[PDB]
């Protein structure tokens, strides 16, 4: 029962993240940039070098790894997150509800997949991810506005 961060690259959890952990002083995680520095290759370098599914692999241990810590914490998570049986039941999960106009200009990247550089595989992606951001989602949270906003919808499921 940590405070999951889900939704797509660029919808701003890693932001939220860090907020939300100093608002409520709890620590933070992100779950890419924990596997990016265990491997010591950017997410990028994972894909290129190692491959998608080794990388859902590194995602799939560390989602029962971070399930057996004992304090709550703030996690973000990777944009694929939601392809893992095993979230469920990680935390309370809330969604980074975005379109995906408002989300391109800030996904230019790093931890950036190689299709998410082409933007009508981006859209795809996006449109097949919609429905598994919300089976996966405790809460939705409009995230088109600000980070305060977004802040905002998340203290209210506190
Ligand atoms: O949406 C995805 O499958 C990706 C999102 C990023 O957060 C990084 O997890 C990685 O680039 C893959």
Known sequence: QHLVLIGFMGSGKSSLAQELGLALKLEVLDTDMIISERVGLSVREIFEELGEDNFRMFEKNLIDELKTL??????????????????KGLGTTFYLKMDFETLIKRLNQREKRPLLNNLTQAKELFEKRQALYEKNASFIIDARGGLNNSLKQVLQFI
């Open 70 to 87: 004992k304090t709550p914490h703030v996690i973000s998570t990777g944009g694929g997150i939601v392809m893992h049986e095993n979230l």
